[model samples]
Target chain A: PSWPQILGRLTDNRDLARGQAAWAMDQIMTGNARPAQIAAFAVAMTMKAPTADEVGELAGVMLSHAHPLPADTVPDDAVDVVGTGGVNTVNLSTMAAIVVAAAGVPVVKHGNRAASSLSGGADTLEALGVRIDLGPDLVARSLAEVGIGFCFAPRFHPSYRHAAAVRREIGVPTVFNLLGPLTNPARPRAGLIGCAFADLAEVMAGVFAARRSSVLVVHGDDGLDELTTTTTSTIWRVAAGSVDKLTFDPAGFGFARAQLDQLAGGDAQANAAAVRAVLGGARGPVRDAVVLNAAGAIVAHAGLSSRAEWLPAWEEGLRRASAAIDTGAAEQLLARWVRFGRQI
Target chain B: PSWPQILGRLTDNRDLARGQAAWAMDQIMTGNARPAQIAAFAVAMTMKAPTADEVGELAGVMLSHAHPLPADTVPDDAVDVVGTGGDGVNTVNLSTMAAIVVAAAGVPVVKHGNRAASSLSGGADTLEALGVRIDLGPDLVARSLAEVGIGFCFAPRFHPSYRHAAAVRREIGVPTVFNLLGPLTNPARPRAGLIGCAFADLAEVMAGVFAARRSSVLVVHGDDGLDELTTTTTSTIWRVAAGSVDKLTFDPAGFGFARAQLDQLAGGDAQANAAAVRAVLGGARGPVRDAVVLNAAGAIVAHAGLSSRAEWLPAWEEGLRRASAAIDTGAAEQLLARWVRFGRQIL
Candidate 1:
């Protein structure tokens, strides 16, 4: 089509952007465009803003082409904590790691290198000596052995090589950026997916709920990709064939913070250090606050009790967290896993 | 601008088609395109009927780039006879050649032409036969009458070279075809002009009104370009500075024929063919009656006073018919003398 016709389709409504985005993704996945054209198409869509349908279509394309990793041998209660990053939020992955180690709930994280925002999930995990080089089989094995696994994105979804330059050139978040959270190569039946934009919560949750059997998509009003202790975040629960919205209030959850400023960190290292201090049982607002956020993931993943049960679970998880730090189990597991995965 | 911006300008209007047409023309005149771009632009513009602003701007662009011919030497009562000829109207160059014949009234005439339309030769070709090349220096052209008596514009001399796919247009004959750009390129800026249009009545009149100025621009709507009768036909005349519109109904009394048929004035070759018919009417009998009458009368009627076509046309018919018959006499010699001094370079 001519440029005018293509542009006209985008401004018609959100639905059209959705359709076109899906169509474009299909082209990329099928290797229809030249490398440069693929890049240009990707950047243009980022500028135009793809719609829900487009995002769904893109997910559909990935699912069609992805080499699915067999479900983790870990028990059914295992969950993948992921987010469509670009929220500029730095704490979600660290919170996921802490919560899984604390509650003994298996966590399989599948994520990408950061494109638009701060340090990516893989980057933060790498800093802490977690193995990011695991292949699909190794990732599955890690889940069975350690109750946690990290799937480095680029290796699993190699088709994204075509879109890399375009994503870089546009330098803004696109719907494709969000597609990673929806795709978790492990194909875990349950997940906690955070979105950068609140407006996307319902559509994204509906998409997940429609395409998969179980998932919880959330957006924090404080702008974090995970549950934010600073403000009332919105959550869309999709389980047992239904979806609903609920506001998550930090104060009601027994967290002292009223705003995001209270939980802010100077850098990724500072955030990672806070997670370390929390696991070490350091008595302070940082440890208490990190516990409150990690408690959400533990409750959501374990599904053993209502979110209200997190109060008791947090006390129990904190002791485990402190023990793991003292015996160096968490750090030792990370180091040993990296050595095993990277062995020549 | 981006494609979105360009599309927005085209579609944001009640009259979407007209807006597209105007925008296309604006792109052409503004130098916003290269040659290949202009080719696409012009074809697209033709597909859409241009608005008046577009037409004006096109003319304005030509005025900006075309070398102007000086008007100082033209008489106060001079007239230019030209046509935008994509009309598929193939007839003798009577109107162009008759200028000198009509100069009996002491009014100067400036005739403009290219080689031909659907005809064998045009005013430029016939004049070229007399050794007057069409492309000449503008100043030398202003001084053309010091020798030959009329100035001729070979279109390319004054207009920019199209430099596009000339063959493509030759392969297609579309409606706005070639007739749209002819009159707008007049080099001399003559005080009065006679323009022929295919749909003579309205298109001609509108063009005359569209182009009329302090002097005068009379647009003649021929039923076809070759047939210039005001019979079942209508002629629209716009007297420029006078701000008057005159529509004349065709009547037989005007041409001394109770009625005239469309086929009477058809064939011609070089100037000799037209001169042959005109000479025959000095008493020779043939089908050249209508053409000679139309040309001679058009030239006279454009400048002189005749309250109505009925009142003035008969005298024009007699004068032209008599002039045609007497061509073998001193009239032919007189024509030849003028042709030698001002028009002929080959003889």
Candidate 2:
């Protein structure tokens, strides 16, 4: 559809909202609209809040736009752990993914670098000298060989590069902020997604519901945009086709309360150091933060397609989440995690 | 002020309204903003209904920014007459004649207007037809007002800052808060004036916007589809003074005018209208004559600030008599001829 033709409908309600939002991604995907026209459309949508169905429909359309990761290589029970990295204090979900991967559950982690934060999973992997430029075949080979495959968002979803002019011009946060993690090109059946705001717990619950996948969307109770080591967090566990809300705490799992402030990581260099520190069996709030989130993925992996038949539940998840960390095998599993980018 | 800053303020109220309005005009004058930005600023103001003092303060501030008409020779007692001009009947201007008559009758008058939005002659267009200088610069016109007791400030030459607003109004397809503001902003800043409102209900708002100036003004919305007073039906009036306004009505008999058809009152086209205007000034009496007289009477009473309406009918004839004598004696014609003569020389 023409930009203005879609724009007028973009500012409307009901099915038009879904279709316009669906149209905008392709405009972004096809490099169609001019920067100003796109900025006008994008920023206007930021002002015009989205409905769950509207956002879900768009995310679904976006996944259709990307070159899908090789489905043949995706393990039946494999899980992805990712977040829209717009927070000031957080390390890679790669930290959590390492443990999940090292535990023999495959991880097709989707990542993009920092927007409003210090660094993202891609930046962390870049600094750690990890190979992230993998195509679908390499991604499958990497997951097969290493159990942890880092999917750089744009590499698979190259259509997003079309919004660069729009990104540079608007120069502000937009609805697309939620787009990356939601459009996982790997289309993993089970995952953990962190929401930047608590209100979105139910909002995003609708998305996972629409995608027909089991994913846990979480937000820190104290305002961290991650599965932080903060005192508590709100988790919306989407499974059995409905969302169940839950609260989680560190001490409940027998770990000391870790301040979200301590979970704060800096540049690519600093986070690469932090990722190594956690993966090398060195323990701290950073390592604990990673374990808490890894445990979330375990809950997702165990919850999907079984009540207790597979991993037997979240209780087993707690056992395996902490067990996956601080082990010789876990450290060894993180080794070639790079082997492709450069030796750091 | 910066365009965004002014637009930010254009997009605020009451007390802040004056500063925001004043800020907008200056930037327009400075050529700082683009057309649509100016349109968005002005058009948005059209939506935020303003209080009387808010409009008044803005008018005062706009006056401060304006090139005051060459007022060095302005008589302390002059007055102005104008209207919003969307009237359907008695379409040709009668207030212009009322102003000339008022001036001839010992009250200095400022007549500020434009060519009508439609084909009907406005105060400027009517006088241009009568050979009065319609494009005299502010200084020459101000001097004309002082010396002849009446002057017409063609709107364009009087306020340069409003050009793009006119441009934007056409470009963007929208509206303004200035519907009745043009007359209230006459550069002469006349002490007493009368305004013709587009809607009868708008009389009160016009009174309020004109109030702070203490111009003892009347804003009338004729029940007939006319902006001026009419014999077709009763008219609504707002008698405004400093800070407050009083509502009143003028039934045809109350103002002592006989009823007549609105269509029977026009001057026809340009040549015919010039003859019609002169015939009225030449003692022609009919519906148009009665309207011009009723308005001429209104102009006198508002100008002189006398005791009662009872003094009016007796006073109006005598007052308008000087105006007609000026017409009969060629004094009125001379003033217009010189007025047009000066304009032609300047060109």
Candidate 3:
């Protein structure tokens, strides 16, 4: 369909077909659309609040345009732990991916530099002396050898530059916000993703269900975007064609409840130091938050097909997450990852 | 308010406050907004479907930026007969012809319009083709009204401030609030108007705007969807007077005219419409001629006050008699020829 036809449908409050939404992004990402057309598309779609089918199709287009990681190097069991990165909280999910990797779960984490955060996953990893922008071979090797690797978003998704400037000017959350975590080029079999909005979490559930991927979509009660230690968090666990909603509380899990400010992160260097402290057996809200999310990633990768089976998995996963840190395995793995990443 | 601020509010489906809507138009009309901002504003407002208060406020700002036709030269009773021209129908330039007939009937007419965009011919397009200098400056427009009892306010020449947003509108290729504001913001600020609303719901909106402006207006929409009074079906009229709008249903049978098809009034290019205008005013009798006379009678009724619904039909029949005479006795054709020549002399 033409741009006007899609736009008219959106303005009239109609949802686009999966292919139609893909066509819209292709037009935008190829720079075929004018800024006026681009802005209208963004605002109208934002106002329309896209369906998951629309969002999932758009993510598919974005991934198709991305620089692919070799399928042979990526393990079929690896899980991606990530967030939508609009909240300025600490990179708890980034730390959680490493902890899950230390707990014997392979992780191919896809991330970017800061957009609305003080430090992003790549920024902290880079500060910790990891070569963040290595090509697919070295990054995938790290995943295979050390059970962890980071795919810098800019290197993987260069086609996004076409609409990046217009998105900046639009200065609002568009569908691209929801696409980031869903478009990991590594194509992990499972994902634990934190989102800024709960409605988007529900939409992501539909996307995960359609793709037949095991996924947990979470939103923090304190607007943290990760499972919150400040209050209860909302979770949409999608696996085997089911989306089950659950509320998770730190208090329910016997973890200390803390204020949101306790999770405040600083410059990349400062966040790197915090990451070192938490991995080096430091204990506090940041550490608990990191472990809490790490457990979620483990439970996410467990492939439990029903909502009733998740509680024991989550409890056992939390124990494994803390054990990975207590035995110094997580810190040792981080050192190996940095040395292996920098040498490549 | 800043353009982005207004645009954000609109995208959120919130109606702008009266002053906020005015501020948005001020920003766009003055070239202070970017094309992206302008495009978003147009699309967002269209989707939101602005309220009468929002549109009225926008029209007020547009009028403030317009070049005024001196109040002294514009008669207090002059009326503008125009259409919101997106119907794409090939109907004759009925409003412009009716304006001429109304002027011949001794009711002052100051018609404001633009060249054809979504239709085959527009009032300015056909009038300019008829040898009328539709782009006359304010002084000549004033002179034409005083001498010929009619003048044409070419939209672009009078609203130069709108030059900035014209590119965005053309590029967007959709109707915006400016389509509604054109007739309401005539530089002369005519005290009365006869407006043909192509979209049904906008009839009451236009009437509300005229009521707010303290102008008596008749906003007509043929039930069959023509903007003018239809000979094929009943036409609904929203009569605006004394700061209120009253709805009235009108049928051609009430005026002793039988039903006619819209294609019978089909028109061509500007030049063809000019010939058609001359033919209609030369006492030519047909569906084309009757359509113009029926709408011209509407123009006369719009010019005369509709103080009550009970008196509407009598005043309407009187208007029909006067419009028919103006066309039959060759008075409307003489006025058209003289105004066409006078328009050229002023240029």
Q: Tell me, by DockQ, which candidate is best.
A: 3
lDDT by residue for model 2 (A293-323), tens: 8878887887766667422465677667667
For model 1, how does the per-residue alpha-carbon lDDT over B1-347 read when each residue is reduced to its tens digit?
A: 32223222322212233344334334544544333233323333333334444554555555566667765665556667665552445555655545545443344666655665544766676556555556666665656654545566666666543222222233222333224656655666665655666655335434543444444555566544532433333344433334455555444345554444454443356666446534533544433444444555565555553223334456456655544543434453354356445534532
Question: What's the true lDDT of residue B218 in model 1?
Answer: 52
Model 3 lDDT vs. the true structure?
0.81
Q: Between 1 and 3, whose TM-score is larger?
A: 3
- In order of appearance, the predictions have TM-scores of 0.48, 0.57, 0.85
lDDT of 1: 0.54
The best candidate in terms of TM-score: 3
Top lDDT model: 3
lDDT (10s digit) by residue, model 1, range A177-258: 6777777777666666778677766767777766544566777787777767667788887765568788877576456765
Alpha carbon lDDT of residue A211, candidate 1? Answer: 54
Candidates' chain B TM-scores in the order shown: 0.72, 0.82, 0.95
Q: For model 3, how does the per-residue alpha-carbon lDDT over B1-347 read when each residue is reduced to its tens digit?
A: 76556776776679887698888888888888777777777777877777889888888888889999876999988888877763546577788788899999999999887786754777788887888888878999999998999988888899998886777767555556567877878898887878888777877888888888777788888887678876778989998888888898988887778888778877788888889988888888877777777888887887777333337878788988999999888899999888977866753
Candidate 3 positional error at A336, Å: 5.9
**What DockQ does every candidate get?**
0.02, 0.06, 0.41
Off by over 4 Å in 1: A1-8, A17-22, A34-53, A70-75, A115-117, A262-271, A283-289, A303-344, B1-347
Q: Per-prediction fnat values? A: 0.00, 0.00, 0.31
DockQ leaderboard ranking: 3, 2, 1
- Give the higher-TM-score candidate: 2 or 3: 3
